[model samples]
Target: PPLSIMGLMPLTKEVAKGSIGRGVLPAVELAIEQIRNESLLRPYFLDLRLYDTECDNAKGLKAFYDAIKYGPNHLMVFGGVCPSVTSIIAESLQGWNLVQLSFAATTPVLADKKKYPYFFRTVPSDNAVNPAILKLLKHYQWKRVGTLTQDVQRFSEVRNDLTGVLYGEDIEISDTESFSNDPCTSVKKLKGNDVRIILGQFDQNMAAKVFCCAYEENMYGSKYQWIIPGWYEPSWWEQVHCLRKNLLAAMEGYIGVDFEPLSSKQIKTISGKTPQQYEREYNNKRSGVGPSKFHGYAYDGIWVIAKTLQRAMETLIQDFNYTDHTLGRIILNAMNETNFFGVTGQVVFRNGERMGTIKFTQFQDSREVKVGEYNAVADTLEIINDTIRFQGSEPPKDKTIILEQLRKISLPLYSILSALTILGMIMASAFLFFNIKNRNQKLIKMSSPYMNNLIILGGMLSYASIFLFGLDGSFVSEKTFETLCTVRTWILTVGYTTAFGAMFAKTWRVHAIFKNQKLLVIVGGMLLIDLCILICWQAVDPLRRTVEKYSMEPDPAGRDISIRPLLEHCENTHMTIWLGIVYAYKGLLMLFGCFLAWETRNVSIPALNDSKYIGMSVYNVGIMCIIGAAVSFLTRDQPNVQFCIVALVIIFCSTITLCLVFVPKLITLRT
Candidate 1:
């Protein structure tokens, strides 16, 4: 009795070189020769027939039909390295009661037992690598990631499976992009989406093309992580027509997930050779450094199929007739029950899919180095060869993180303004001391030295507000900022009232001498209104510190970082209403003082000549206060600029007013 197997191989030049014809077919032949020599199937012989499928779907279907029509009757089919060829041929194989098993095809469609009842394979489905990648993402704490897939159904299937797992695990999928031939647009979209961790499913050549696009787009750096298929040929980055350096730079520190090619050396395979011995023998037969990656799977494929057939034939002789239909069912049953150690690992099929170990590798400095291993049965990831390397100092964060930047007045401007304000205060102090020392003199008495002293004291209080305006959360606690803000309001309000009241009183006296009169009553009326407003504002709604956030700004130097500016402000509930009341009262006082100064401008007495300086002082203070208030309100968000403008206005106008009221008296006293 003899069993026949039709091997659909890539035998012609039209098929890609290093495919099953040159790479895996020799291992199948070696296994057949060894099985014959060992007399493993004594009474039954295995006839392994070879047909050139050219690794094409239509070609493979015709090859399979011709084998059935003209070649020896094959109860099973093997050697489907190309998944497209294997899939089309597998559909018709079930009608013929033939078992289909592949040594290299990894498409997940074959694992569906309902569609291809006879399909089995030594190579695991590409979906098996998803769990390994998931674990890798978990270990690195990457919660969000983007995915890129070739438009082909094979890679899409893998991407679909991965996203399903990601959803179940609570991992976020930031974006999903697919390309048919050129991956340029897809890669650019991934960058546009701010994707930091990327998972890609595509062929080796397509991988090169995608990464070349990545290099041009500047997507590869310490901020990015790339996870791709590990089954690519060594130095695949160099195989493309694009600059090798460009591909290498983009693909550097990329993580790969692939199936482990060999089991432990201690265990012997079903072919009676340790994995090491088999590898040595495989290398000895091949002219290159060693056998291709899938050669061991090919060798194991022949052994398992032969073992299943041998076991089924043993029972066929004792219990049933050896009809072609009955023989396939028995062989399929034997395959389901088959379990043993093979060169790759324990050989077992679950729903026509191999349960195996996945190898995690990383490309570093032009070498594919093993970093970890994940076992499907135990569901454990083991660190094996070396620690993983990244382009950055450490593992990249899954997404960009916001860094809060608290904005404050510039220190240099603060120092300069503070010095100018201090100088104004010193000038006011000198004027106060001079008027007090010369109080008995006729010149000082005629000018009302006490009123002049009140003006200097008011100017000093207003100058202190300049320092208070500069205080913020950047220099002190937020609570302190709130306190300083309230203090500044009170000092500035009282200072303005005292200074304007003194000028109003002197102007009213001059008006009375020339043609008008209750100086204390008018000053007290303004002071009482100011005090009432300040007290009510404090009791009802005190100013509280608030932090305001602005729009995010990207770090110009690094894409992984972003900046958020934090602005501190002293806020009140009815801020606009309180400010309007205070401004109106102050506006009325300034208008009244200007009117009185205009009325007394032409008085003939030398003592009443002081009205000229008062008019000038009133106009200077009025113009500067109006301009400073307008500009400060308009540029409130710019802390440093507002502080400088307000401080300079206060210093300039206060110094000018003190000089106008006091400098003329000093010159008159000297004459």
Candidate 2:
């Protein structure tokens, strides 16, 4: 007795000669020949009536109905190869009470037992490689990654599941990009985000376009890595018309993951032959055609059907059921109980899904080299790390580190500035002491030693502010740095008004015999106004530590390290407005002082020679202040340089001003 079976598969019609259909047909014929010769199912041989589905849903259904109309007893349906065609035929199988077993249809939707209860497949679910990819990432300690999707339903489902799996493992997805016909925008997004590690999902043609886009975007290099589906042909990049060298450059260093399509060596299949023997015979028979990637699975798929039919034969022999419905249930029950080792590996069914292992291959030296295998059933990864070769010393980093560089004035520069400011303070103190010591002298008295003391005190305040400007987060806490910012502003502003106001009063006395109280009223009013602004600046909008980051660069010291230049300085709300107000106030004060100094330039009283030096002091301080302000703003990013330049200007200007006011008095004392 020969049991007849129906097969609806993509053949020479709408399918390529190298497609899964044409390749698997030879393996199916071989399996049927072995089953007929073997005594596995006594006195019952297998007969297959195959039809071309063209991978079309309507045509596949028509073939199925035609096979049923032929009046032969078809114990079961062998295959409906493509997923779209398989779903249509498999859904209609339950109506005819026939069970359909697929060889290459791996659509995840096919795994739903409720929709198509009669459907079963030898191949695993499309997302079976997720665990393998997850394990590979974990082995490399890569926690952050990005994903590229083709936007098709199958790949989208796989990506969604992978996202959830990665999320549970605490792995971060830096970017998720999807595209339709073109992947340029998606590839650009990955580059824009600086994503180094990418997981991809796409078919062969789409893969070519993806790498082409990657080539154009320059996303491939020693610093980048891609893990994509492995179902593409060995020379998938060559099928499309593009720059082959650029595509190769982009495709290199990529890792491929897919279901293990072949079994390990020395394993004997239930068909009484080793995997090598089966492959050798398959090659011998299909001499002119190219070998399909999933031939082993197809070979194993046929054996699964045979095993299920063998079991059903026993049940039907005990209680014969001529009706199609009874026969279909018997076959389905037999399939659930079927388990055997075939050419691919151990074959078992769990809710119509196969428990297949996954293999990892990496594109090395322009070819795929097997680097690892993952046993999904045992949850173990067998990897040969020595076989793996990367473009660099090791795998690329998942994400470049944003190395935080605290912008601080260097120690040598700070020390130099601090020392100069200290010496200037010493000079100012010496002038103050000399003024007090000679207060009884006529020349010193006429010079208004009281006001001279104010000038020395103000210069000391200005010199003290140098240390505040040099302070940074390295030497002080951020909170303390901001406080020092406010302190420096108050000291510098008050110091300028104090020193310039004293000089203005002396010039006023020389230009016109102004009363001392009237001059005192002008100086006091300036101080009062400055104090009010300083208080408001502190209360309404105080300066705080702010960080500015520059572009990334590879560290000169190490390959793995990257340098991100930073500028940490004090910034306040309405910075321009506040700076403008302060600059205007200082400029007005300088303008009045310069005007008085100019008015009294020719007036030379030997007793009041301090007036000429005071006039020179006004010009020197005003010019230096303008230069320092312009240079500070221009070189603000260079903290060390800015601190050095500003500190030197303040020290020299204050020292010269102090010398101008008092050095002549020393000459007078000597004479």
Candidate 3:
């Protein structure tokens, strides 16, 4: 029993696959010789039949038919290095389940197990390249994109497949035009600057025409991002390098996916020889640093088919009278189960396709530099490499765009609300001045000028604090930032405490069982409660200033709505929720004090509630505290406008204290 391998690709060609193409057939011969010496191929002897199709589809198909007509052990077919050749033959291979294993073919067609049941390759399909490119575009927020290529069927498959991928990422292509090698009809519906990303795919000659056409039309320049396909041709780079000045300038700042060169150690394993020997062996010039990529595939192709046949022969021994395609099915099973490190890295076939790692590069003025890499393990592109950066003339810093669209400012709404609120505050401040300055000794005796001043001063500071540092502070170690955050909490807690403590003392005085202590003692104790909360708040963790980046994800209604991505203010990352409870305690005091004031309104020894104004003020502030607490609880996410609502509550309640408790006194004048 003997196995045969058919090389349905080029065996000798400098332009097609370079030295590796010619070297690959020789590598297969060398592997066969090594295996024969061992004489351990198990149930079958192996025959390494090498044929030259020049990697052309027509010629490859001719070579394939010629072999099957005469060869008996046509169980496994090896060496289809070109995609176009392998795919055409793969269709012909359908009915028989001929285990056709390719070393170079990477079309997505073979990955369809139903259509190409007997197909498997050592190279990943173009489908794998899509994720890496999409990752790069999304990183730079290049939402508008396009595609360019020759109208040929080969490149069209790549272009059409990528369009589906880009769409899946919510990236719409503004212009997906085809090239004609003619500058005029090259891109019929291209939208220029609007499209910042251009995914281009073309053959060697067609690319020359496409680039110059793009150059004349100003499509390939600094502003535009041209992403070439993810397969590198070192010889093509040499040709591009040999280009005229104008063409090279057009390619500057472009990006592409480059195949990482195999290490010298790996090259030795492929052909059992380095690149230097082949020059003397076959041609005038020394072969490239090593054989072309074909040798690596050729070497892997031989071993894959041999391993498949070994399993097939083992099974054939058990079932001498198996089904018609017994060996075909057995070989395919072994090929599908392939999992080992090959020259190109780990060789594993999933869904009839191979998986491999890839590298991304950027083309500068003179040379192409490494930018990033795509990991086969993660199946995603990462820009952690030092050279990778945002794409543009003046590209933005490293950043990720939120899933939702950016927020647009509505100036009229902001302007009108801010102006009207400021106007009300200005009027409140003016009346507050007269209410304090024009007070007489009679009113002062009833309201205590010293205690009234605390309420006026404390209430004024609370109102002004809103306008002083609205949502405009950061954690910059700047003196202004330090003062803004530190003063915001200090004024907020203490200011309201001083005003409410005075009123609480006033109402409590009438009910003082023993007249041992005056209003000052009760007020001091009330004030001490708020001060203790503040002291514990600062000691526990205290509020520090910091501005963190946040994301605004999309929702079902429309998209995500983040009017702003930053929240700049004092972030109390400590036991400050207890401080919030203290505000609740302050409200509890307000209700208690109002009850006392209402009860003593008819008593002549009213203590501080003769006119019944303090009762109204106390209840109004009590409701404000409850509302602020509710708002704080409801919102616990970014753009957490809860703090702003709380600040507005402090302002409104303080305003009511001035109007209800003090402004009424000024209007009456006790006349």
Candidate 4:
């Protein structure tokens, strides 16, 4: 009887084309080709339906449901590109006893042999890659090294794997940095040091950029070594060659690992057999490499499932225990006992975990060469150095829990502090505005430029203090010091808000005295610029903090530097909304301040004739301009900071000239 089967959702672009593609189709075609060629197997009827998942979790779930709706006698699935999505599919399919075998999914969660009976994969998990990299690091006797990774989920998985191994081996990472899909910025920070080795876990483009950047930065100088996780596409090799030709006297030796061996003879020999012949025939009719190096694992996955199904079929036929419940257990037992040599390497499923052999390749003259092979079961490496040497033993026990907790806790604390600081500023603003409103004296009555300048100065100090104290508390200690630090941060935020509110009000009063309508419009314009500038400033601040936090050097001896607290609590949705709100608030405040200043023009105040007040205002505004200039100089590296300081100076200078100098002189002439 023909058996109907279910396949996993096709998430990657590779899965879209039928057998011509590298992911699921290639695996399916290869399996069917093998079955068709085998005389005994040809007698059995089979109908396979491929579900296109497009790599999305929701779509994958829908595909699985559709497969069930079709009512297959047996089901097989392959290719989940993302660990998170794979987990979702696995969880959804738990009750159905569907025979799910992921050809390439390597998430540790799916390998919980105790929980997921139906789930199986041909490729090793991220957990499996850790020990291999650790051994390589130890083999080279690298005690300290730096890591550059992309800020993405897959890269995060790689980082987690690398960190687990490093911690187990008691290795200290000299530095760790992440770049937001921007290679140039990441490359700019790569400093030459004793941390000679650079491990990159990023996409091919990013990896190439990092390599180019490192070469430019002299990171590949005589002392340093480079290791990439995998040899990306052929185009990446071209990039490496171009960089080598352009940048230096000689290219640094770089190493990488791949499941597929680089030797053409080896690849040809392995794939020239029945399955390859079958795949080649299928590809002749298709447009892509349906059975690519990666898809070979998927093919093996199908074979594993078929073998188990066959075993279960025999058991059912012999014992009359053919019900779905009994068949499920039989399939699992058959899978548990499976040991087959597939296209990629030897495959075995024992104790509910699937194991596969991994080969290590190194770049050599624009090509890759197989230098080593790692066996998962023995946890050993066979290095091909003249003769193969077996390096055995698992990596040291992982301290991932500790590191994960530290990362989790640290991220949140910073975010909480930032939000609290912003909140404090808001509360302070309310206080000052309400107080000024309650006291019926016209705003112009208190318009001393000295007081206005003093408020701005105070606000600047408060802003700086809150950031410094919050960072000190979070990074340095865990006790009451943290609480005290947080409280201090809130106080500073509030203080800054109060000061800024007062300063704004005083500026409004000055506009009224000047009777220059155009000047009031400019004041509004300045406010708009300030708000826009602050938004950019905050966005870049987090990147700077990340660099400072993980850089090789300890926090500058006395400097209080912290990554912005807002990032810690910035959930995806929250961050988007917060950024929008910040910009909007800035725009609205500028508009309101400008309107108020315009309305106040031509209002009279009694204190205008006092010479002491006039001179004091000029000195105060001059002092503020000087302070702003100093701030600009100190933060020269940060364009946004410099912009803010320049804006402050312009605002204060205009106030002094228009309000203190011209306004008084104009009023005198009119009298």
Candidate 5:
């Protein structure tokens, strides 16, 4: 069975009339030249049928179906100028078992092996490219960035992957605007100097147009850096010069991460001695144009595929044990073990994968220079390649040093501090309890009051324990400070809720002691107050101001809340007055409890009387006082200690008021 291979080449009549056609035709001719030169393929002469897809998915699909219909012994099909068309053709040719290799399809989802095993790609997918860009951005310390993408699937895939990587790095996306048929609209929206870095993932033509648009709008200059991924040829520089001579001059400081590394080996391999040597050369001989690093990738793709095919053929012819299943495994193994040196440095396929070596580069006076090389297997970044090395001896100066330092301050430290604080509070509270009990002989007389106070204190301790036991400082370990800030929302929410709940329960117990009929009303009012305060606290805008305030390096103005203003506001505002009144009522309850216990010392803790309830009352009051003192000592910064002291004083005052007013009424009732 003769193999039929279908290929879709971009061949619009307009493109054929233009320089693009001139550039592409030579590449096609070069591919044919390579096929002709191969000694093994001389017998079959390598019949190839190429259809003009015109860069249209429908046209590509039609061409593919036509190829299948005409059926010229196509074993595999290689053509797809864009991701959208590759996707459609891949789906259409699913059950045919026809292998499809794409030269330009770089969308991440396209390489999903499970969905499309027969599909293979030469170019690194957008998923691969986006992360590489992110690494470069981080290496240069560009914290605030923007993305300019073509409003199509090809660039959108890159845009989406870039966004994911940015989010992972916790980098803030300053702006994101799309460019399509009109690049000027995007240019209009872009602000000069606001965006520190720009990521463009458009085609060469559109990308050039965007560069020109940026130049016209005065958005492309030294203050604003542009990063574009792909080949930066002489024409690219010409376009930059035409747009603005200063644009390239300004771009001297700009950085880019290209898929290919331009080295001495590539240069030597491309340049040859004679006309036949020139013809046989992979660069100018096949493409009939000056070679680019991308051409090397394309060349590697062809060689790797050809080598795999040759191996498959050898296994079938030479080995008697070869079966279809065995043959597939052998092909997979060969693809995985492929580690060969080509025009593009070293090429190695890992686990049947074929992404090219991603190298980081920067533009200096319009020339592409390699700065760093990244290896996915070892997850290492190597700066061995001299072409892309940093131009200056000293590292690039970081403008966002303060912001970076703030981010560098460990978040786990806050959690650790909070945990230790809570633990110290609990231990102090326990110590206070034992000390009070040892000092007061009356506490052992009654159990319920002692038990009730202990339970309340235990609950407070439990509330603080939540912070100690469940605090996860790892959230702060994120590379970007903005991420740590964002994650604080949930942490504060949980912490505050538990704190308020414990406070509410303790307040309710005091209300019960005073036999206050307004217990529910007070609790409900407090809950409302808590809700409003929490909302205001969490919703405080100008987050940077907050971070600058309490973040170990405190800002003086940050903690300048005046007690007088707070009190005045509480008196004047209806909502604040309501909350204040609830607070006053709670204070009254606590005060009256303390006063009743004091005056009724004869009734509650009568000297030499062994009443169980009196003993309980004594125990409870003693424990409550000790716990309050301990809390005050441990959490001196918090308002709890002040509130407790105020409550106790208020209770004592209320007790005196009650005794003076109700002595006669009490005597009558008893009679």
Candidate 6:
């Protein structure tokens, strides 16, 4: 009696018979045979007891008990293709301390070591896939989606698991239904919810049925997205009953996660062979080593038991059997402690399960092609291949959030906008330095040092604000986008408020020749109003990134909907209250400047500080401010145009002070 191990293969009925069970068991047989040949387990011929699962829990349950009761009470059991049977057998193995290795069962609930201490798996849990799916949703900027899965509790667990992930990513599961549920009604409800992405979990035949419903509803083209797990490979598409052009048509914009990143190998053979024959022949040809992913797991499953059992066998105590705690317990401990690199990947465990990588593919044009690979451990999915060519030309765009992430920024446009702001900063800074250096000279004697310096500082900051926050055409995260908006708004507001405030203070002092200390206090007080307003605004409701929807005009048919252009920058959060406050408060300073300038028009003063020139400059500044504000409001949706308005205002305003005030004082023309 060779050292015996038991395996449950899902070949009794029709669930993944060719790819999983047929491909798997033969690899398990070959693995044990290879173990017999290896130096590490020499003279240890291994026997594998295979059981037909029939794809039913009862049949799988009966098979497990019979193997333990009738045959040699095998030290280890490698089994359970599907989650339902794996869990059934895992739960049933309550008393027996025998360790069970599962090759394909990947329900996350099975990872609790305490509930199933003797259970371990070589396949990744469905939890890995949920995160990857959420990654795609976020990448595409899909805030909401509809979910559909099989009605069977085990399969339906993917739906719930996916829901948890979407919510974790702050995404919405807009609607929920089962694939096995009423198809017409289910898809109709999903459409009513107006979700662009339909996340589905079903077999190939079941997916065909669901997608046919989409065809009936005209839910296939650019308006809809279908995402399915790498649930079942589409081998059944070769059959005539399952072949429907409508089903394939529904899958056009579909994306899927392929968990088995294992490259599919051809299983070619002679005539009069079932597709199952391909699986069988492949195993025969590639039996001993270098098998497929599921086959690799089967190979590793046997070796782990052999290595652990061989070590535990040498330490076997007298009068001890398989059930005896001392020997079987040692085997379980050895497996937990085991680590090795295998054909599948690095074989390691946390909470008694493997973390396999998954592939993301899309049904581009007509074929199901691989697009990416995701490592659940790293929590990353990188693209390998993207879209396909259509009719000898690249396909047209499908409007998804993913496009925003991958879209290129227009540097040519950014360059001019950027250059304008940067030049403003440089010129303002240079002029400020010239004013400071000439403060004691006759050139600056007539110019007001305190007010002119303050105005220049604020103008420079305004230019700096635009440089930092405006014209970011590429993708930015919600948080970063909000931060830029807040910084820009605050700086722009404070710069304008202080600059205007200081000018107001100067006019009052020059006209009345008021006390220096009182004038300084008045200027500070005016600036403080803008600061306080922003502070209170933030406290009430801070700035953050947001999206808005606009209704498209109704088409001839009844399907009317709202669509908003994507948000390239953050919002001022509640724009209505805060934005109104911003402009209204700034207007107060402008009106005060106008009033203060008028009051001093008749006052006699020094030639360089003439009340007439001051009045003219202040009045012109007010006019320019109003024009800038008006243009900004009209062109707010067009950012580049709005920025151009702001830049022109700054240039014109800067020019007025240089010519009317500074140039006259320096040339001694007014003095």
Give model 1's TM-score versus the native structure: 0.82
For model 1, residues 426-452, the per-residue Cα lDDT tens digits are 888888888888888776777766677
**lDDT by residue for model 4 over 1-671, one digit each (tens)?**
56555655453555443232334464467567666666333446456666666666677677766666665544444455556666776765547655567766656667665566567777666556667767766665666777888898777777866786677575787678888666656555556333556677777767666776776676653355666766366535454233456433223356676554211223332234544554555466446433345556666666776676677667752222224566666666777778866665567875445665656766554455667777766777677774321112222221111111122223454455556546544543443454344344443343443444335444444644544543532355444553454455345434333343444555455655566534335444554555554445445542112112222222332222222222221122234464455446544654554455445434455543233333444344445645764685476334334544554454444334334432443254346
Lowest summed lDDT window (length 10), candidate 4:
396-405
Q: Give the runs in model 2 whose Cα sits over 4 Å from its true position.
A: 10-22, 36-38, 49-66, 69-71, 137-146, 151-176, 190-194, 239-242, 313-324, 397-400, 438-446, 513-529, 532-566, 571-578, 667-671
Candidate topping TM-score: 2
Model 3 lDDT per residue over 32-52, tens place: 765676665754567767666
lDDT of 6 by residue, 1-671 (tens): 46677777676435644357776666666565566655455555667878878777888788887887788767677878777788878875647766788877777778887888889887778767887787766565777777877787666777777766666457767788875655777888888866666788876767767777888888777567788766565543444662376666666767777676342323321122233443455467665533444776666667667767767766553333455776667877788765665545456777788766777877765567777766666677676643532322322222332222222335665578677667766767766776787788763766567677787876777666656555453545656767777777788777766666666777877766632257668878876777788789778888776543333322332222233444353555567777787777767777887887887777665623645676777787788888987887787555566666676776677556534644554456334
* lDDT for 98 (candidate 4): 55
Instruction: Tally clashes: model 6.
Output: 2
Evaluated at residue 395, the lDDT of candidate 3 is 48
TM-score of each: 0.82, 0.88, 0.51, 0.50, 0.47, 0.52
RMSD of 5: 18.7
Candidates 1 and 3 compared: the better one by lDDT is: 1
Local distance difference test, each candidate: 0.82, 0.81, 0.62, 0.53, 0.50, 0.67
Give the clashing residue pairs of candidate 3, or none: 10-55, 20-292
Clashing residue pairs for model 1:
512-516
Candidate 2 has a TM-score of 0.88
Error of 1 at 272 (Å): 3.9
Q: List, residue by residue over 132-156, the lDDT tens digit for candidate 5.
A: 6666666666777777889987678
**Higher lDDT: candidate 2 or 3?**
2
Candidate 5's displacement at residue 452, Å, is 72
User: Which of the two, 3 or 5, has more TM-score?
Assistant: 3
